C-alpha cells in the first residue's frame, strides 16, 4: 500500500487521483487517504503529489508511522474521490509546514 502523510493536510492538491488505476483515494475536508486493501502499489501517484506527501508503506518516515493506520481507518469512513479538483485555497502557504496532523478534520 502507498500512504498519504502529513504534508497533504491543508494542501490537498488532488493531482494523485489522476494517475490511480484503481481509484483507491478517499476524500476528507482537508486531506486524502489511500485505501490499503485496494491499492495495487503501482507507485504512480507518488511522483504526482506536489507536496511529496505519498510514501510506500515501507518507506513512511519513523515520525509519520501513525499515518499508515490513519489511512486505513479514514478510508473506511470517507467518500471515494476519482476526479482531480482545485487545491485548497491557501495550499502553498501550508505546503511544507511540519506538524499539520493537529489540523486534520474528520
Ligand atoms: S500506488 Fe497506485 S494504486 Fe496505490 S494509490 Fe497510488 S496510484 Fe493508486
Ligand atoms: S497533497 Fe494530498 S490530495 Fe494528493 S496530490 Fe498530494 S496526496
Curated annotation (Swiss-Prot):
Superkingdom of source: Bacteria
Keywords annotated in UniProt: 3Fe-4S, 4Fe-4S, DNA-binding, Electron transport, Iron, Iron-sulfur, Metal-binding, Repeat, Transport
Region (Disordered): 83-106
Cofactor entry: [4Fe-4S] cluster; [3Fe-4S] cluster
Binding site for [3Fe-4S] cluster: 8, 16, 49
Compositionally biased residues, Basic and acidic residues: 95-106
Record-annotated 4Fe-4S ferredoxin-type domain positions: 1-29, 30-59
A GO molecular function held by the record: electron transfer activity
Annotated S-S bridges: none
Cofactor, free-text remark: Binds 1 [4Fe-4S] cluster. Binds 1 [3Fe-4S] cluster.
First and last residue of the signal peptide: none
Annotated positions binding [4Fe-4S] cluster: 20, 39, 42, 45
Known function: Ferredoxins are iron-sulfur proteins that transfer electrons in a wide variety of metabolic reactions. This ferredoxin could play a role in regulating gene expression by interacting directly with DNA.
Protein name: Ferredoxin-1
Amino acid at each position: 500500500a502507498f500512504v498519504v502523510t502529513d504534508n497533504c493536510i491543508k494542501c490537498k492538491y488532488t493531482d494523485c487521483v489522476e494517475v490511480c488505476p484503481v481509484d483507491c483515494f478517499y476524500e476528507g475536508p482537508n486531506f486524502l487517504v489511500i485505501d490499503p486493501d485496494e491499492c495495487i502499489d503501482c507507485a504512480l501517484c507518488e511522483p504526482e503529489c506536489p507536496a511529496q506527501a505519498i510514501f510506500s508503506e515501507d518507506e513512511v518516515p519513523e515520525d509519520m508511522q501513525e499515518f499508515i493506520q490513519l489511512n486505513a481507518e479514514l478510508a473506511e469512513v470517507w467518500p471515494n474521490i476519482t476526479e482531480k479538483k482545485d487545491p485548497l485555497p491557501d495550499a502553498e502557504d501550508w505546503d511544507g509546514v511540519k506538524g499539520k496532523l493537529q489540523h486534520l478534520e474528520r
